[PDB]
Design a protein around this ligand. Structure first.
Ligand SMILES: N=C(N)N/N=C1\N=C(N)c2ccccc21
Ligand SMILES: N=C(N)N/N=C1\N=C(N)c2ccccc21
Length: 330
């Protein structure tokens, strides 16, 4: 089997992407944030505290003839950004882009934190990291990909995120028309449960490439590119007036600037992030200071190749016996 679904930015800045997912019988379609940095499929639901729902579409398990309570199971997750959610668990039929998994754990939120409530466009998350990070207790549950894997034509999924435009998540096949050149594959460590890999270095704009190992994770659920402070300083030093602002919480730059590109290494290959991809717009409406798309990972404890980086590439999440990541230009 295979599946193919379009993913759409939630706003004009690509702050996140939503992908429609069919849950239950008859289908209830919710728009979920596909997150290769976490491993829970959770949804706003008929059980979510009413004051914490503001425009989201909810899953109602009582209206699904295939829903079954996973008796005794609960979940609770805290994300690196400080947001959180928790609740109980059903199993149900879940389809993405024509690919169907029966018996998928669907984690129904009883509580969500304020940032989830405030995002009326995101009805929940679909985790695509390794199932060892799944939070369901006392019986940990498998991700949608983990459950689908054996049925797929090939044990892979791909992320092809757009810049200020829709893109595609495919399951079970590589669309060789969606990229240029060849795919460079690189080793993955699953020891922390992430798609963790080592970039071979970077360049700023037209500058020379610096060969240096940068361990980090491929995370579709993180908006920005978080890298070591040395790398980030070298980038922003090429932008007149750019500075790290403690009040804003990161690097900002004049909205009048044209940003340089940023290149990262994948083995001997190179992925070029155009400068415009690094512009996240005014820090507050109408401000002449703009928010940078490359930020320091200092304090987070891991480097994160989030959407800013991934959207510059066609990215293969290879879930074969030995998992690997692939990157191609596009
Ligand atoms: N990851 C999410 N589930 N939602 N992320 C966001 N939601 C926003 N409104 C926003 C603005 C700037 C950066 C990220 C986000
Ligand atoms: N803290 C602030 N006053 N503004 N923070 C932002 N402003 C943006 N444009 C943006 C995009 C992505 C992530 C954060 C921000």
């Amino acid at each position: 089997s295979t599946g193919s679904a379009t993913t759409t930015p939630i706003d004009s800045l690509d702050d996140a992407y939503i992908t429609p997912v069919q849950i239950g019988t008859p289908a209830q379609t919710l728009n979920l944030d596909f997150d290769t940095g976490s491993s829970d499929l959770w949804v706003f639901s008929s059980e979510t505290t009413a004051s914490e729902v503001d425009g989201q579409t909810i899953y109602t398990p009582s209206k699904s003839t295939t829903a079954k309570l996973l008796s005794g199971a609960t979940w609770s997750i805290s994300y690196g950004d400080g947001s959180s959610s928790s609740g109980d668990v059903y199993t149900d039929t879940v389809s993405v882009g024509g690919l169907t998994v029966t018996g998928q754990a669907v984690e129904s939120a009883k509580k969500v934190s304020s940032s989830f409530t405030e995002d009326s466009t995101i009805d929940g998350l679909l985790g695509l990291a390794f199932s060892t990070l799944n939070t369901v207790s006392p019986t940990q549950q498998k991700t949608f990909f983990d459950n689908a894997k054996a049925s797929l034509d090939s044990p892979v999924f791909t992320a092809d995120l757009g810049y200020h435009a829709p893109g595609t998540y495919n399951f079970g096949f590589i669309d060789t028309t969606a990229y240029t050149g060849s795919i460079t594959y690189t080793a993955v460590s699953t020891k922390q449960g992430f798609w963790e890999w080592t970039s071979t270095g970077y360049a700023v704009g037209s500058g020379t490439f610096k060969s240096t190992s940068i361990d980090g994770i491929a995370d579709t659920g993180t908006t920005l590119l978080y890298l070591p402070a040395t790398v980030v300083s070298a980038y922003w030093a090429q932008v007149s007036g750019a500075k790290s602002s403690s009040s804003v919480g990161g690097y900002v730059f004049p909205c009048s600037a044209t940003l340089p590109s940023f290149t990262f290494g994948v083995g001997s290959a190179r992925i070029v992030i155009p400068g415009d991809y690094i512009d996240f717009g005014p820090i507050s409406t109408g401000s002449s200071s703009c928010f940078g798309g490359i930020q320091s990972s200092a304090g987070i404890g891991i480097n994160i190749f989030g959407d800013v980086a991934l959207k510059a590439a066609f990215v293969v999440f290879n879930g074969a016996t030995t998992p690997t990541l692939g990157f191609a230009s596009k």
